[PDB]
Design a binder for this molecule. Structure first.
Ligand SMILES: OC[C@H]1O[C@H](O[C@H]2[C@H](O)[C@@H](O)[C@@H](O)O[C@@H]2CO)[C@H](O)[C@@H](O)[C@@H]1O
Length: 652
C-alpha cells in the first residue's frame, strides 16, 4: 500500500526529476514530509498496473492525454483548487486536464516538438521536409547526416503524418467521433510514405531511438534532431551551437505536432491527498518551484502565468509555442491510448519493411477505433506473462498418478512456497494422463503469471536454473533444458525477455469477437462450476454441488462463475469485494456436456467438459466481452490454478 505521511512522486526520466526533488527537499524542510521522486521505465503503462490494486505513487506526472483514461478507470482523485489559484494558470491548460466536467490533474507545462539544428553544420535550416534528402547527400559527403530523431515513439513521427491531413478523431459538436479515425486518409499515407522513403534511401535508420538520436546530435554527428524542451539541457552540456526553430513543412503544409500538457495527477488511493494538494499548489506551481525544475531540464511553456510571462522572452520558448500553435492539444479521452498503440505499430511495421504503408495504416485505423476496456477487474490481472518450461528427467519416474497435483505443489515450492500462490500463477500441464518416463525424457508444462506475480516468477526462474539441487514424483531428478515465451514461442533466460498480454492485445482480440457475433466456447480441461445456491436456504452437498448436465449450463450461470473468478482475484489483491452485476442477456446453447470422473485413491480432478454456442448483440458491452476473452488465459471455476476450467473461444 501507499505509505501515509510521506509523498511518492513519479515523473518521466527525460524530465527534470532532480530539480523536482529539490522542490521536495524544500517541502520536507517546511513540513517534515519526505518527498521521494522516482522515474520508472514505462511509467505511463506502469501506473494503471499498480494503481488498479491500490499501489503506486501519490502523484503521477505525465502529459494530459493519458489522464482521461486514468480518470475513467477511477485512478485519479478530483483536484479542488479555489478560483484564486485557477486564475494563476492559463485557462486552456485547465481545459486539457478536465474530464466530464471535473478537474483531474494540475497542469504544469505545454510541450511541443520543435526542429533543433546545429548552427555550425547548418547555418540555414530547411523549411521543407522535401529538402532533407538532397541535404543529406551533401552532409554524408562530410561524414555527417542531415536528420536523426526517435522513430520508435509515434509522438515524433506524428507531426509529419498530420501535416497533409492525418488526424486522430474527428471533433464535432463537443464530441470526438471514435469511429472516424484519420490515420488512413491520403494525407496520413503521404506523410508516412515520405518517412519510409527516407529510411529506404539511407537518409534515416528504422532502428533510431531516443538515445541514438540524442547522442548523434550532441556529439556533432547529425545536423538536425526533433525533440522537446526537456532535451535542451543535455545540448547545453555538449557545447553544440544549436537553435530551436519551426518544424519543416510537408507539401506546403506545416508539421502539426500533438501538443501535450505535462500534468500532475493525484492517485485516487493515496491517503495523502491534502498533502499532495499543498505540495503542488504551494511549492511546485510557484515561480521558484518551476524554476528549480526548469533549471534541471527545461519544462517548455509553463502553465503558471507569472513565470511563463518571463520565459516567453526566450526565442526557444517562442518557437515551442509557434510549433504548438501549428499543431493541436491532444484529446484526453480514454481512446488516446488505443490511438497511440495503433500508430506506434503502424510506423514501426512500415519503417521496418514488414508492412506496406497502406496496409500498416489500414490496420491502425481499425485498431484506433476498437472499443476500450477500463474494467477494474481486468486492470488488476493484466498484464499476463506465460512460459512453457521444458525439463529432462535424470532417472525414471511416473506422472499423472496424483492428477497433476504434485506438479502444482512442486512449482509452488520452487516459487518460494509463497502465500496467495493461486491468485498469481496458473499451472497448466500437458494433458498426457499417466506416463512413465525414462532418464533423458522431456517433461513440459506451462505457467501463466498474473499482474503482481513477477517476484514469484523470478524465484521460479532461479529455482529451475538450479535444478536438481533446488528440490530438497517431481523431486531432485529433473534438470532445466529451456524456458520458452508462450506468446513469442521463442527461448528466454531472464524475465525481462518475456512479452506481455496487455490491455492493447486484449482490446484487439476482444474486437475480433465483437465483429464475429456468433462463436463457440469449449473447455480444454474439465470445469468445476458450483451450482447456484438453493433459494430455500439449504446447502448443496457432495458431487451434487457442481454442474454436469447440459441443463445445468446457461448464460447467467456461466457469466456468474466467470465473474466470480475475477472478483476473487480482485479481492485477494485489494481486500475489497466488488458487487457482482449481471451481464446483459445473450444466447447460450450447450451443445455437448459430460462429467469426467478422475478420482485417485480425492476427487478434485473431476469436472465437466462442455461446448456452448454464444450469440451477442451489436451493442454488447466490450468490457464484459473482454472478461470472456481474458478468461481463456486464466481459467475459471474451482482448481483453476491447477489448470482446471481452461476454455477457449472458437468460431461456429
Ligand atoms: O509516442 C506516444 C506517446 O506520446 C506522448 O508521450 C510523450 C510525452 O508527452 C512527453 O512528455 C515526452 O516524454 O515524450 C513522450 C514520447 O515518448 C504521449 O504523452 C503518450 O501518451 C504517448 O503514448
Amino acid at each position: 500500500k501507499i505509505e501515509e505521511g510521506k509523498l511518492v512522486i513519479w515523473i518521466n526520466g527525460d524530465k527534470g526529476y532532480n530539480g523536482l526533488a529539490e522542490v521536495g527537499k524544500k517541502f520536507e524542510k517546511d513540513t517534515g514530509i519526505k518527498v521521494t521522486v522516482e522515474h520508472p521505465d514505462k511509467l505511463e503503462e506502469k501506473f494503471p498496473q499498480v494503481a488498479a490494486t491500490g499501489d503506486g505513487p501519490d502523484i503521477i506526472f505525465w502529459a494530459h492525454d493519458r489522464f482521461g483514461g486514468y480518470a475513467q478507470s477511477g485512478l485519479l482523485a478530483e483536484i479542488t483548487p479555489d478560483k484564486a489559484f485557477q486564475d494563476k494558470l492559463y485557462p486552456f491548460t485547465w481545459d486539457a486536464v478536465r474530464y466530464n466536467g471535473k478537474l483531474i490533474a494540475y497542469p504544469i507545462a505545454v510541450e511541443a516538438l520543435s526542429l533543433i539544428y546545429n548552427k555550425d553544420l547548418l547555418p540555414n535550416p530547411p523549411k521543407t521536409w522535401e529538402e532533407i534528402p538532397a541535404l543529406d547527400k551533401e552532409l554524408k559527403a562530410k561524414g555527417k547526416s542531415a536528420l536523426m530523431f526517435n522513430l520508435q515513439e509515434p509522438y515524433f513521427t506524428w507531426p509529419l503524418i498530420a501535416a497533409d491531413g492525418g488526424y486522430a478523431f474527428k471533433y464535432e459538436n463537443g464530441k470526438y467521433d471514435i469511429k472516424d479515425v484519420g490515420v488512413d486518409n491520403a494525407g496520413a499515407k503521404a506523410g508516412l510514405t515520405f518517412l519510409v522513403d527516407l529510411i529506404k534511401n539511407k537518409h534515416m535508420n528504422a532502428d533510431t531511438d531516443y538515445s541514438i538520436a540524442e547522442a548523434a546530435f550532441n556529439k556533432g554527428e547529425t545536423a538536425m534532431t526533433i525533440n522537446g524542451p526537456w532535451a535542451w539541457s543535455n545540448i547545453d552540456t555538449s557545447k553544440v551551437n544549436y537553435g530551436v526553430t519551426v518544424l519543416p513543412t510537408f507539401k506546403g503544409q506545416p508539421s502539426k505536432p500533438f501538443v501535450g500538457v505535462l500534468s500532475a495527477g493525484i492517485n485516487a488511493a493515496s491517503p495523502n491527498k491534502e498533502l499532495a494538494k499543498e505540495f503542488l499548489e504551494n511549492y511546485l506551481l510557484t515561480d521558484e518551484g518551476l524554476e528549480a525544475v526548469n533549471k534541471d531540464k527545461p519544462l517548455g511553456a509553463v502553465a503558471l502565468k507569472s513565470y511563463e510571462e518571463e520565459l516567453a522572452k526566450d526565442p526557444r520558448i517562442a518557437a515551442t509555442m509557434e510549433n504548438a500553435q501549428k499543431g493541436e492539444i491532444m484529446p484526453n479521452i480514454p481512446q488516446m491510448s488505443a490511438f497511440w498503440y495503433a500508430v506506434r505499430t503502424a510506423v514501426i511495421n512500415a519503417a521496418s519493411g514488414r508492412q506496406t504503408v497502406d496496409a500498416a495504416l489500414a490496420a491502425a485505423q481499425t485498431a484506433a477505433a476498437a472499443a476500450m476496456v477500463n474494467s477494474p477487474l481486468i486492470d488488476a490481472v493484466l498484464p499476463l506473462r506465460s512460459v512453457v518450461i521444458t525439463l529432462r528427467w535424470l532417472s525414471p519416474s511416473k506422472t499423472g498418478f496424483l492428477h497433476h497435483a504434485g506438479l502444482h505443489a512442486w512449482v509452488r515450492f520452487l516459487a518460494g512456497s509463497p502465500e496467495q500462490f493461486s491468485d498469481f500463477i496458473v499451472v497448466e500441464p500437458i494433458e498426457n494422463g499417466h506416463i512413465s518416463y525414462q532418464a533423458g525424457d522431456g517433461y513440459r508444462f506451462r505457467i501463466t503469471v498474473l499482474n503482481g506475480g513477477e517476484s514469484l516468477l523470478d524465484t521460479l526462474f532461479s529455482s529451475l536454473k538450479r535444478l536438481p539441487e533446488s528440490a530438497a514424483a517431481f523431486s531432485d531428478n529433473l534438470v532445466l533444458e529451456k524456458i520458452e515465451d508462450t506468446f513469442e514461442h521463442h527461448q528466454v533466460t531472464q524475465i525481462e525477455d518475456l512479452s506481455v498480454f496487455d490491455i492493447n492485445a486484449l482490446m484487439l482480440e476482444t474486437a475480433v469477437w465483437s465483429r464475429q457475433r456468433r462463436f463457440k466456447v469449449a473447455f480444454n480441461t474439465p470445469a468445476r462450476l458450483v451450482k447456484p445456491k438453493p433459494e430455500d436456504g439449504t446447502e448443496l452437498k457432495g458431487q451434487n454441488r457442481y454442474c454436469r448436465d447440459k441443463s445445468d449450463l446457461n448464460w447467467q450461470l456461466f457469466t456468474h462463475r466467470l465473474t466470480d473468478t475475477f472478483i476473487n482475484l480482485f479481492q485477494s489483491r485489494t481486500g475489497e469485494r466488488l458487487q457482482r452485476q449481471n451481464w446483459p442477456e445473450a444466447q447460450l446453447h450447450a451443445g455437448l456436456a459430460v462429467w469426467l470422473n478422475n478420482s485417485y485413491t480425492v476427487k478434485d480432478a473431476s469436472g465437466m467438459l462442455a461446448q456452448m454456442q454464444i450469440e451477442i448483440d451489436d451493442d454488447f458491452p466490450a468490457d464484459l466481452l473482454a472478461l470472456l476473452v481474458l478468461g481463456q488465459y486464466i481459467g475459471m471455476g474451482q482448481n483453476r490454478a491447477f489448470g482446471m476450467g481452461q476454455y477457449q473461444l472458437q468460431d461456429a
